[PDB]
Structures are given as structure tokens and as C-alpha cells.
Design a protein around this nucleic acid. Structure first.
Ligand SMILES: C[NH+](C)c1cc(NC(=O)CNC(C)(C)C)c(O)c2c1C[C@H]1C[C@H]3[C@H]([NH+](C)C)C(O)=C(C(N)=O)C(=O)[C@@]3(O)C(O)=C1C2=O
Ligand SMILES: [Mg+2]
Ligand SMILES: [Mg+2]
Ligand SMILES: [Mg+2]
Ligand SMILES: [Mg+2]
Ligand SMILES: [Mg+2]
Ligand SMILES: [Mg+2]
Ligand SMILES: [Mg+2]
Ligand SMILES: [Mg+2]
Ligand SMILES: [Mg+2]
Ligand SMILES: [Mg+2]
Ligand SMILES: [Mg+2]
Ligand SMILES: [Mg+2]
Ligand SMILES: [Mg+2]
Ligand SMILES: [Mg+2]
Ligand SMILES: [Mg+2]
Ligand SMILES: [Mg+2]
Ligand SMILES: [Mg+2]
Ligand SMILES: [Mg+2]
Ligand SMILES: [Mg+2]
Ligand SMILES: [Mg+2]
Ligand SMILES: [Mg+2]
Ligand SMILES: [Mg+2]
Ligand SMILES: [Mg+2]
Ligand SMILES: [Mg+2]
Lengths: 100, 117, 100, 115, 210, 127, 83
RNA sequence: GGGCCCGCACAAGCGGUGGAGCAUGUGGUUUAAUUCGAUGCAACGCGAAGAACCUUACCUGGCCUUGACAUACUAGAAACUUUCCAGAGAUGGAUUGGUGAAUCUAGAUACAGGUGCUGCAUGGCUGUCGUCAGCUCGUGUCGUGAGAUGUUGGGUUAAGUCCCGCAACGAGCGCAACCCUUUUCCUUACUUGCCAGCAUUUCGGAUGGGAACUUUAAGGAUACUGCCAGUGACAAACUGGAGGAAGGCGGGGACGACGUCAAGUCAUCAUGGCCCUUACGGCCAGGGCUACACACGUGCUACAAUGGUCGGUACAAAGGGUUGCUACACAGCGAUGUGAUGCUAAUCUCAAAAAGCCGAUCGUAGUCCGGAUUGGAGUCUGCAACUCGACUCCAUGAAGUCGGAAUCGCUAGUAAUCGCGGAUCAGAAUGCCGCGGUGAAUACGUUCCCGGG
RNA sequence: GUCGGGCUCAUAACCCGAAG
RNA sequence: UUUU
């Protein structure tokens, strides 16, 4: 059975480290992995007036980026998914797992 | 600017590769509608060529001489407008023929400048 | 703002929370097509019989610290001023200064 | 040539010359010359009087210069006398649909005036 | 004037965030506000403690707060009745079973937060602000940081016209993004009103991004 | 006998496949005049091969997505000369002195905070 | 205007008053703060002392005045002239 | 006050504004009230990233007192949940299900409470000069000394940038670089995205498949006068031209020194102080901010043919979407309505890009220009569109035929033009912020105008 | 002469336009 | 050319 693991984060130094932390993890007691594909990132921006009273031109322009990554485990063993949920996922990275 | 700058080059027109007529269709051009300009000027040339058989790249250049560079192009394009006979490709082509035959509309439009001498 | 305003909006959205399912089923009954029309008039009349402050159209969104109603951001729940001063001291996830 | 009490232009397309009658635009003239069967391209100069009277019967089913102008001024009169908001606004030559008045009303209000 | 906040510009560059979680685009504000109250309360619960930073992690739908303080004693005291009940007191504010660890801050002199704490704690002691600022920069430059500016503004000790005074000893590169610069601002609530303390401290550039 | 070129101009990509054959062109499964009604876009689509005066020795199967008329015309010409001098390297001098080798860098400049149009600022007003 | 499939809008207080004063043919005008309730044929003959922000103006619901709201008959802005 | 230098400051060009219709902010006036703030540059589509009620702070009336909410004290009751009426509503009444912590009620004392005043008592934040190039220190030298030097001069430069001179030699903060983006290439990653080469083709990557290519997103390479010529003072620098995807700071953005303007803001917040406490506090329903003899600012749309209309056919990027976007079907002239469908999204949808190209049509006119304005009939949001919404259809078809004195923006993918998106938001953008399409002309020069070192 | 605009950080002058 |  297939295991599609999708990673989400607000930072990429976290999502990539978690992905290459779990890929090796599986590949140690199994195989048939399709690596962390990088999926296009969402980037939503904001304008914030910075003064208290009246200055339309003075604005801090901010961003927030959500990065997403794909990971395929095609036919893992029965000694793999146990060690998959047996791994502590950091903060700032969310992982959602779906059996195909 | 304050010290010195150079001029800019333009890619010669893809039909005849003559830089002057390309600079000229960059004068009828307005608001970025280069297609309108190309149609207008190529039509003017294809009208002045079939009657009064002359090589048209040779032709526009042997007729602008009696108009004088950029100033001649402005005088042409505006003297080409105040005719209201048919589509603009025609009141540029008739104005080129009027400049060749030595008329007063563009051949002697700048005569008021030589009159001032 | 003046605490009357924050209590007023706690008031209004508390009401909307109270009469929520009622307003929902009434709105549903109206748009019915397989229902009698005496009911499709009773439902109208009963819906507009509610408190003015029952329908969330009357609410307005305010800052999670100050309560300032102009310059709101639904992504954050705060208005502009405290948002700026929190993004800068490093208290929000993902947000940086944008440039491209 | 002479339709609904106006001399529509003659040497011009039919759909465009039919709109000179106060009460007909492009949609209504297209409806007319569709219900009679004369294409819009036909210039009036080339019309036999076998079709002019049919299209006259057509415009006769349309409110045109006289009656249209009449009932127009009559509704405004109902408004003026009923003393409602828009009748008041009609008495003063001000924008009535709810347009701004601090400035930008020189079409209802007329040109600019000095002190 | 009109300078950008020091930490805010080197946030995606060389500084980390004081909040590390993830939240879907319609459940983000819930989490952020649950976080803001927790910070707001901890900064009073541990005010006479020596906290310099609060870091809130929401790992996979959990709650874990790490406070980097100087005296773990005042926030613990007797071991077994506060930090395991302070987690109870936080869980009520985050809404998620929380955990609170201790970051023993060695070199308790590199924090603009704590330098501002001591400076304002002296200002509200009615001390001469010049000796205060300068004693603090003595305290901090000696301890190994390579540059310090201290800024103090507003009706200083009770005159009727406001004025601003700073002291800069060492190196403080602000336009250099790879510069590790701690910066902290506080308000000394004197009986004459408000004095603003700002404190920049530098320690040497960051070489290698993150 | 199959050579590839990737040609970017503004937001266009113009995957070009050049092969030795007749003079035949298909622009995204469409003929040269079926695609660019602006027959100057075809003129510069036929700039490089005609400069080498071949125009009959190669077939071109091309696929371009992104941009507009002029952007895609310049992108296709770009990808064509890339495929061209990937075939016969010694060609690069000539295609260099007419300008067909250089990836034109100018992209649209972004709007600014406080500006009408990225260098257009509001009409200044005094008193 | 209101959507014809939602029907006309009338408030409950004013309409209860109108239905209670039609069964009495009262001559006392109906004092209301609505300004937004539409005029029904029910209303003809009656006179409504409708608000105008400051005062109450009673308007006598005449025949051509159906399809209007109450408030349409009380100008809320005082304007006589500028000079 | 001189001198030099610089900068769309002027010049040359391109396009606007001042003219006309409307949108919007201000002044005034008006008014019950038209809430307050912001006044040269640096206020005037400004706080407001969205006034129908709400927001709301103002006016009109109608109501409340430990007060809508903090804690400190006393007593009976689990929080609750129904249902009706008077009422414009607040507000009250009247009824059902539940049986030491809590959540209202009752009371009293401090107190709460004010968007009230002072930004000239303050902080915290911002404009502005101005991304302007400056601001200093250590030693060493000169001046009894304060001080000076350095940091000046010839050049140069975007630049206290660099060189050469020189009683200065160094150093720091500013400059630049480190940061993000865009341009070329490489390594990885191959799905939801891709289709080069095979075949299956229901002609659609669709479907097997392939991991090439485009793309996607992580880690890197490249550019540095490096190379040659020339001018130059064994100089910096500058002019090339070769190469190169890119050549000299390749393009943009973020970052805004020391200080000035008692610049802006007690109406974000906080705060010292002063004032109010049956009201300047709290709660309501209607109005109002939407007024209109007029005056200004900033925009949107046009006056036509390089155009209007109608038909046919292309090509974007970037964003949004579960209370949301909705394939498709049915109804309508349409706005939309009903069923119906996938989607928490590189998968489904918004979504059609427009200007462009092809064909006809109009033939230089107040017109098939232009849409103001008005009458008529609707749709949707909403509890309600009168005051005071947007959109849709029919009719209606003003002004306006390139605009005075004057004046503004712009040096390249820019001006000019053509459309798309979002934030705010139930609905309400010509405004703001972004996105891409097409795509110029000119710069002789510093005498002047304007701001600075 | 007046009134509206232009001009200046602010004034007249001056320029324009209008009414008379 | 009038005022700081
Ligand atoms: C000298 N007067 C008039 C004055 C007094 C006060 N303060 C007070 O009223 C008294 N302050 C107390 C409460 C007694 C401590 C004042 O507070 C002020 C001022 C002056 C104004 C001048 C303003 C001026 N105007 C023309 C716009 C201006 O242009 C400037 C400027 N160009 O910088 C100003 O400084 C000004 O805006 C201003 O700030 C003033 C005052 O602050
Ligand atoms: Mg307050
Ligand atoms: Mg609202
Ligand atoms: Mg007509
Ligand atoms: Mg810099
Ligand atoms: Mg861009
Ligand atoms: Mg603006
Ligand atoms: Mg002006
Ligand atoms: Mg000029
Ligand atoms: Mg003020
Ligand atoms: Mg009491
Ligand atoms: Mg001030
Ligand atoms: Mg201040
Ligand atoms: Mg210099
Ligand atoms: Mg330097
Ligand atoms: Mg002041
Ligand atoms: Mg105060
Ligand atoms: Mg005030
Ligand atoms: Mg109200
Ligand atoms: Mg307003
Ligand atoms: Mg028209
Ligand atoms: Mg006229
Ligand atoms: Mg420039
Ligand atoms: Mg553009
Ligand atoms: Mg000067």
C-alpha cells in the first residue's frame, strides 16, 4: 500500500531537514521511496501602515510563505511504518500521511 | 545627463532591415500599438511602389532629403494626418508621393523655415 | 477602545452565538422549494422577528489587543498597530519583511 | 421617409435611421426590422412603400414621440405633487438618484455660478 | 531617524523566531492569540525573575514553552510545586497540555533585555542616569561583547523638557545583517512619567547564514 | 540529427526541436501563419535560419507557453539559435554579431509602494 | 428595490398597529420610528406620524403613495438656502 | 554671502493637469447634527485595508446608577432552558425542563469608567531633509588654551568610493558587501506538474509508460578591469572590444548615519498631570457624516477613423477559494435562480485575459463619436437598500470637436497604453497594493529655475 | 475697479478669464 | 521688487 506523506511549514530549513531525516529513516529498514518532491509555495503578503496617525506612503510590506513537500513510500514493509510513527516531528513542520 | 550619455540603437525592421523606416514607424507608433504602425507604413510603401515604380527603401530615402531627420518624420506624420481622404496607410502613401513630386504639403512644408533665411 | 465597545462586541457576538442554529434553520426553511408558502411567510416573519444584533452582518472585527476597528487582518486577528510591533519583535511564525 | 411623425435620415442604413424616433434605440430598431423581415443593412433610399407601412404599423405598437414624452412628464408630475423625496429633488434641479452634491452636479444643477 | 527594528530585519536572515508552530490559514489567529496571552502573562509571572526570551512550540498539536532566564531558582524555588503547576497554569491559557523547561543563561550580561532590566530598575530607583548607563556599559563590555550602545529618552529624572542621551562604547554594526545584535527596549515608569531605555549589544558577526 | 533549444524572452520558454529536413514549421501544432497573424513575428521567427540563409535544411517542431506575441516570437528565435549553434558550433560568431545569441534580460519591473506605475509617481502638488 | 420573491417588507410593530387601527377605524395617527416600512394598500386613508430624525411628521397615506417606504415622505435634511 | 559639484532640478522629447461629465478628499457655507483628527514642499482617494443599521465617536428623543467590564466584603440559589406580551428598541414583565468549587442576582464601601484637555510634560511609533554623505576616536604633530590636524588640495566616483599629494599614521560607525528577487548553467527531487522517444489513441497526456524537456523548489557556479588597446601623472579612474547569457554599480527591493523641523500622533497603545462622576459615564431606536450659491486637490471617462459596432480566431503572469470557488444541465435579453459536480487544492474552480490578427460596416458630422442625465421594469446581499448599495435590461443621448495664464510625471522593458488579481469585506473600488501584454522618443549642455553636500 | 484662477514659504505687481 |  502507498504512503503519501505531505509536509507543510512556514520555513524551508525545517521542512527539508525533516524530509531528509525521514527518507533515510525508511530507507534504513526498507526501500521503494520517491523522495521529497518540492511543490510550489504559497506566498501571501501584507501592507501595514506604520505610523499611528497619517502617512499613506510609509508602509511595512510583509510576507508569509508556506512551503509544501511530497514524499512517496510505495510498498513499505511491516517493519517500516512502525518506525515512521516512531519518530519525533519537530515544531514548525506539519506532516499529514495518507494511504494513497 | 549632467555629464554625458550615449544614444540608443533600434533593431532594423524585419521586412527590409532599414533602420530609417523602422525609426519612422516608431514615429507613427503611439501607446505601444506597433502592429498598427507596421501595417500603416508597409501599406504606404506598397502603395507608393506599384505606381511610381521605385525601390521603396530607396524611395523614402530619396524623398526625405527634400524635407530636412526626426523633425522631417514629425512633419510628415502630422502632414500625413490632415488629409482625411481614406485610411491612414493612404494619407501617408499620398503624402510620400506629394513629397517626391515636390508639393507644398511636406516637400515645401519646411519651406517656411527656408523662407526665414 | 473604550471598554464599552469591547463589551458591546462581546455582547453582539455572544448573541449571534445564541441564536445561531435558529437563524440557520429559518434561512433554510425560506429557500425550500418543496415546502408550503404559508410556511415560507411564517419563516420570513419569524426571522425578522429576531434581535437586530442576532445576524452577524451587524458585527465588526476588532483588534485582539487594542480593539481598533480600522485596519483589520483576518489572517492574524489583530489590527495594524500591534501587528507591526509583534511581527518585529519576532513573536509571529513565518512573517518576515518582504522584498522581491 | 416619414415614420411616427419624424423625418428619419434617408441615405443611411435602416436600423440606424430608425433610432431617430424618440423611443427607439438599437435593440428596439433591431426588434422592428426583425419582426418585419427587412435586414438592417438595407438603406432607406432603396425601400418600396410596401414595407414602410408595415414598419409604421410596427412603431405604432411602440411608445413614440408624443405619448412617450407626455407620460414621461406626467410621471415626474405625479412625483412633484406627491411631495416625496424625488419630487422635491426634481423641483430643485438636483441629482435625484443619490449622487454627490458638494461638487459634481453641473448637469442637473446647470453651469457654474459666481457670487 | 526612522530606523528598522534590529531583530525584525534579521529574522529570516540570521535570527530565529520566538514562536515555532504551524497553523492552517483559517486556524492561525486562534493559535497566535492563545500565544500572545501566554507571553503577556509569563512576562509578569516571571518579571522579578530574569527572563530574556520565551519560545513557544506547538509540535503536532501540543504545547511546549521554554523560558531562557538567568535565575532558575526564583521560577522553581522548591522543586515540585511550581514548574509542574506552572504547566497547569499555562495549559489553561494555551488550551493544550503544556510543558515548561529552563534555559540556564550563562554569561548573564549579553542580553539587551536584562541590561535594559537593570538600567530601568536603577532609573526607577532614582539614580543618576549617566552613572547608570555608564556603569551598565562597563558591566556589559567587560563580559565579552564587542560593542554596546545605551539610549535613554524623555524628561530624564524630572525636568520639564525631554532629551535623549546615548553612550556607545565598542562596535555596533546595524546595517550588517549578519551581525548578531541583541536589542531590547523598556519603559522606566518614574514618578515624573516615562523614560525610554533602548539597549543595543553586539558580540561579533554571524558567518554561515543559519 | 535531433537538436534541442530552450529560448526564454519575457515569460515565454519556446522549447525548439531542430532537425535536418525540409523547410517546414509547426508552432505548437499550428502553422507559422496559423499562429502569428503579426507576420513580423514570423519575420523574426525566421530571423536566424534565414540569416544563415538555410530556411530549407531544417524542420522545426516547437512548443511555447507563456508571454504574448512579441515575447513568444523572441523566445522562439532564441531557442532556435540555441538549437542551431548546439548543432554546428562554429556558427556562433555570426549569430553573435547580429544579437540572436543573447538572452534578453529585461523583465517587467515590479510596482512600488507609493508609486503609480513602478516609476510613475503621483502628480506632485504644492501649496 | 427589495427582491420580488422576498415580497415586500413590513415591520411587525407598525403592521400590528395598522391591523389594530383598521379594525377600529381610528383617527389618531400612528406614531412610528420606522422610515423603512413599505406602504401597502392596507394603509390608504390612514395617517402615519413617521419620524424624520428630530420630529414626527404625519403623512396621510394617499393613493399614489403605494410602493414607497414610510421615510420617503419626511425630508431628513434641513435646507432653505445658502445666501 | 560666495565657489564647486550633484540630482527628470532645468534642457530635448513623450504624455498628462488647468477646459468638459462624473468618482473622491478638503475649504467654506449650510445644518438638529453635518464626529474628530491631518494644513506649503512634508495636509487634501490623508487615519479609513472599504459610514445602509452595526462601525459611530456626532444630533434627536427615550432609559441606567458600584455603573456594559477589575478586585476587595455579605446572603439565598448549580450555569441554565422554554414560551408569551407591552414596547421603536433599550427595558421590563409573566412561564415551563434541572438539581468547598463555579456562574449570574441582591447590597456597600473604595472604586471602576471618558475616543474629555494638554504631542508644549512624556514614552512608543512616523514623516522629512534624504540613501543626502557624513559623524567621530586613538596616537602623533601645531596652538600658552579653547582647539586644529587627520576629515584639506588635484583628480575621480553612486558615494569620507579610491588614488596621488601632503604631519599625519591608523581605527570605528555610516557607504559598499553580508539579505531577498530577476537573468544563464549545474546537482538533487519526478507528483497533482511535463510529453522528447515508443505504443494504446474514445483524439483529450487520455493511458500505458518515460524522467528527456518545460516547470517546480532546495543546494551551488558565474562577473572580478579578468583579458588586449587607448587616454591617465610608474596612479586611480574613464573610453572602448574581445569573450561572454549577462560588463563594468547586469536590473529591482529591504536596510534610512549624527542631527533638524518644540514637524505628526494623549482618537492604536502606554503614561505624569488637570478636569467629569443622576454625567463629558453606560444603553437604545431614527438621523448624520452622503447637505450645496460655491472654492481647491487628486483621479476616471471621452471629444473620434492609429476609431466605433458586429462576426471569427489567438497568447499571460500573479493571486483567491470549505459559511468558499463552483465543470455541467435547465430557465432568462441579461443581472441571476434551481438542480448538480470536484475541490482543504501544481489535481477542481474563479477564468473570459484585453489591446492583437482576419471580414464587413460607418466616411470626418455633435456622427453608429461620447456617455452624463432622467423615466420605466427587475436581481442579489442583508433584519432592512427612502434618506444612502452594487449590478442588469429598455428608453433617454447634456457637456464635450484636443483645452488660457500656467503646470506635473518620466532616461528603458521605462513613459504610453491594454487588461487581470487581491486586501479590507454580508454587499459596496475610478481608491490602495500587486500582475502580466504591447511597447517609444529624447538627453546639445549647466547660463538659468528648484533641493542639497 | 471687483470677482475667480495663475505666481510666492507668504504680498502686490504681472498674466489670464469673466461680469459689468 | 514687499515681509522672516
Ligand atoms: C508659539 N505658539 C503659537 C505655540 C504654542 C504652543 N504651545 C502652547 O500652546 C502652550 N503649551 C503649554 C500647554 C502651555 C505647555 C505650541 O505647542 C506651538 C506653538 C506654535 C505652533 C506653530 C505651528 C506652525 N504652523 C504655522 C503650522 C508650524 O508651521 C510649525 C513648523 N513649520 O514647524 C510648527 O512648529 C507648529 O505646527 C507648532 O508645532 C506649533 C506649536 O507646537
Ligand atoms: Mg482607552
Ligand atoms: Mg461590517
Ligand atoms: Mg432615438
Ligand atoms: Mg547598504
Ligand atoms: Mg516581477
Ligand atoms: Mg496616494
Ligand atoms: Mg497645483
Ligand atoms: Mg524639459
Ligand atoms: Mg493638532
Ligand atoms: Mg449600587
Ligand atoms: Mg512633537
Ligand atoms: Mg514623540
Ligand atoms: Mg564627494
Ligand atoms: Mg569609508
Ligand atoms: Mg506642535
Ligand atoms: Mg494623560
Ligand atoms: Mg484630540
Ligand atoms: Mg445608532
Ligand atoms: Mg467622509
Ligand atoms: Mg456608442
Ligand atoms: Mg455644444
Ligand atoms: Mg533616474
Ligand atoms: Mg505594466
Ligand atoms: Mg543651488
Amino acid at each position: 500500500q502507498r504512503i503519501r506523506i505531505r509536509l507543510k511549514s512556514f520555513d524551508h530549513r525545517l521542512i527539508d531537514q525533516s524530509a531528509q531525516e525521514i527518507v533515510e529513516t525508511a530507507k534504513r529498514t526498507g526501500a521503494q521511496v520517491c523522495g521529497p518532491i518540492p511543490m510550489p509555495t504559497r506566498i501571501e503578503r501584507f501592507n501595514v501602515l506604520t505610523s499611528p496617525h497619517v502617512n499613506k506612503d510609509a508602509r511595512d510590506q510583509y510576507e508569509i510563505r508556506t512551503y509544501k513537500r511530497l514524499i512517496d513510500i510505495v510498498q513499505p514493509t511491516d517493519k517500516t511504518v512502525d518506525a515512521l510513527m516512531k519518530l519525533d516531528l519537530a515544531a514548525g513542520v506539519d506532516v499529514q500521511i495518507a494511504l494513497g | 545627463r549632467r555629464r554625458v550619455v550615449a544614444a540608443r540603437e533600434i533593431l532594423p525592421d524585419p521586412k527590409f532591415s532599414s533602420q530609417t523606416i523602422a525609426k519612422f514607424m516608431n514615429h507613427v507608433m503611439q501607446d505601444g500599438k506597433k502592429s498598427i504602425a507596421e501595417s500603416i507604413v508597409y501599406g504606404a510603401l506598397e502603395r507608393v511602389q506599384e505606381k511610381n515604380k521605385v525601390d521603396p527603401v530607396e524611395f523614402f530615402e530619396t524623398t526625405l532629403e527634400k524635407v530636412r531627420t526626426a523633425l522631417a518624420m514629425r512633419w510628415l506624420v502630422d502632414a500625413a494626418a490632415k488629409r482625411s481622404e481614406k485610411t491612414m496607410a493612404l494619407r501617408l502613401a499620398g503624402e510620400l508621393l506629394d513629397a517626391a513630386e515636390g508639393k507644398g504639403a511636406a516637400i515645401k512644408k519646411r519651406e517656411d523655415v527656408h523662407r526665414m533665411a | 477602545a473604550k471598554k464599552g465597545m469591547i463589551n458591546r462586541e462581546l455582547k453582539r457576538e455572544k448573541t449571534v452565538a445564541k441564536y445561531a442554529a435558529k437563524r440557520a434553520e429559518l434561512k433554510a426553511t425560506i429557500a425550500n422549494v418543496n415546502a408550503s408558502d404559508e410556511e415560507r411567510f411564517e419563516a420570513m416573519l419569524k426571522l425578522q422577528a429576531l434581535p437586530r444584533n442576532a445576524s452577524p452582518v451587524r458585527l465588526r472585527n476588532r483588534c485582539g489587543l487594542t480593539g481598533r476597528p480600522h485596519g483589520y487582518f483576518r489572517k492574524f486577528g489583530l489590527s495594524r498597530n500591534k501587528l507591526r510591533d509583534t511581527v518585529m519583535q519576532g513573536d509571529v511564525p513565518g512573517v518576515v519583511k518582504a522584498s522581491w | 421617409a416619414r415614420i411616427a411623425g419624424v423625418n428619419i435620415p434617408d441615405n443611411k442604413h435602416a436600423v440606424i435611421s430608425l433610432t431617430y424616433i424618440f423611443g427607439i434605440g438599437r435593440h428596439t430598431a433591431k426588434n422592428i426590422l426583425a419582426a418585419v423581415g427587412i435586414t438592417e443593412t438595407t438603406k432607406i433610399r432603396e425601400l418600396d412603400d410596401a414595407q414602410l407601412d408595415a414598419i409604421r404599423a410596427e412603431v405604432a405598437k411602440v411608445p413614440t414621440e408624443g405619448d412617450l414624452r407626455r407620460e414621461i412628464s406626467m410621471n415626474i408630475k405625479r412625483l412633484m405633487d406627491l411631495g416625496c423625496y424625488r419630487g422635491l429633488r426634481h423641483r430643485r434641479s438636483l441629482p435625484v438618484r443619490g449622487q454627490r452634491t458638494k461638487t459634481n452636479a453641473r448637469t442637473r444643477k446647470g453651469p457654474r455660478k459666481p457670487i | 531617524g526612522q530606523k528598522v527594528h534590529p531583530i525584525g530585519i534579521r529574522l529570516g536572515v540570521v535570527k530565529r523566531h520566538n514562536a515555532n508552530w504551524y497553523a492552517n490559514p483559517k486556524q492561525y489567529a486562534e493559535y497566535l492569540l492563545k500565544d500572545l496571552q501566554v507571553r503577556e502573562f509569563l512576562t509578569k509571572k516571571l518579571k522579578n525573575a530574569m527572563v530574556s526570551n520565551i519560545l513557544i512550540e506547538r509540535p503536532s498539536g501540543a504545547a511546549k514553552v521554554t523560558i531562557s532566564t538567568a535565575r532558575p531558582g526564583i521560577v522553581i524555588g522548591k522543586k515540585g510545586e511550581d514548574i509542574e503547576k506552572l504547566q497547569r497554569e499555562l495549559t489553561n491559557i494555551m488550551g493544550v497540555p503544556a510543558q515548561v523547561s529552563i534555559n540556564e543563561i550563562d554569561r548573564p550580561d549579553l542580553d539587551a533585555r536584562l541590561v535594559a532590566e537593570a538600567i530601568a530598575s536603577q532609573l526607577e530607583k532614582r539614580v543618576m542616569f549617566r552613572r547608570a548607563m555608564k556603569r551598565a556599559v562597563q558591566n556589559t563590555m567587560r563580559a565579552g561583547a564587542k560593542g554596546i550602545k545605551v539610549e535613554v529618552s524623555g524628561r530624564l529624572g524630572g525636568a520639564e523638557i525631554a532629551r535623549t542621551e546615548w553612550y556607545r562604547e565598542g562596535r555596533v554594526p546595524l546595517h550588517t545583517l549578519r551581525a548578531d545584535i541583541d536589542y531590547a527596549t523598556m519603559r522606566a515608569e518614574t514618578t515624573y512619567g516615562t523614560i525610554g531605555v533602548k539597549v543595543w549589544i553586539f558580540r561579533g558577526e554571524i558567518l554561515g547564514g543559519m | 540529427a535531433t537538436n534541442y533549444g530552450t529560448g526564454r524572452r519575457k515569460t515565454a520558454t519556446a522549447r525548439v526541436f531542430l532537425s535536418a529536413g525540409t523547410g517546414k514549421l509547426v508552432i505548437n501544432n499550428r502553422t507559422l501563419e496559423q499562429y502569428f497573424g503579426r507576420e513580423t513575428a514570423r519575420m523574426v521567427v525566421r530571423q536566424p535560419l534565414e540569416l544563415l540563409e538555410a530556411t530549407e535544411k531544417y524542420d522545426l517542431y516547437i512548443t511555447v507557453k507563456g508571454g504574448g506575441i512579441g515575447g513568444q516570437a523572441g523566445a522562439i528565435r532564441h531557442g532556435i539559435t540555441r538549437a542551431l549553434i548546439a548543432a554546428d558550433e562554429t556558427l556562433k560568431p555570426v549569430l553573435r554579431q547580429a544579437g540572436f545569441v543573447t538572452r534578453d534580460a529585461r523583465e517587467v519591473e515590479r510596482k512600488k509602494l507609493g508609486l503609480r506605475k513602478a516609476r510613475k509617481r503621483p502628480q506632485f502638488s504644492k501649496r | 428595490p427589495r427582491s420580488l420573491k422576498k415580497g415586500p417588507f413590513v415591520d411587525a410593530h407598525l403592521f400590528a398597529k395598522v391591523e389594530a387601527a383598521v379594525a377600529s377605524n381610528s383617527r389618531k395617527p400612528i406614531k412610528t420610528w420606522s422610515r423603512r416600512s413599505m406602504i401597502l394598500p392596507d394603509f390608504v386613508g390612514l395617517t402615519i406620524s413617521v419620524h424624520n430624525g428630530r420630529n414626527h411628521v404625519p403623512v396621510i397615506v394617499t393613493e399614489h403613495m403605494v410602493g414607497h417606504k414610510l421615510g420617503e415622505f419626511a425630508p431628513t435634511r434641513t435646507y432653505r438656502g445658502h445666501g
